[PDB]
Amino acid sequence: HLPLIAITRNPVFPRFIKIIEVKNKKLVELL
């Protein structure tokens, strides 16, 4: 029951650590 995150061209392969940095700030409210 959560909104969809903004991928912003940040693929996440299975069993692989990745870093997502979205320019938006609204997501910080969700965090």
């Binding site: 912003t8 061209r9 940040n10 693929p11």
Partner: protein, 62 residues
């Protein structure tokens, strides 16, 4: 300003990987400027609207 290109933009972008890797090698072995700018403009982020400008910026370091 002529920007003619081929329709199949599938393998033409491959050379961009080699160009950026060469730029990385130059900056690592020959540090002239701060490396933050390269992180800011990442090819994977897709924000590169005009690859000609990125190529010029990379060559500008030469």
């Amino acid at each position: 300003v002529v920007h003619e290109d081929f329709q199949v933009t599938e393998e033409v972008k491959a050379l961009t990987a080699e160009i950026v890797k060469t730029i990385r090698d130059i900056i690592a072995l020959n540090p002239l400027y701060r490396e933050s700018v390269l992180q800011m403009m990442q090819a994977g982020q897709r924000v590169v609207d005009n690859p000609i400008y990125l190529s010029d910026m990379g060559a500008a370091l030469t």
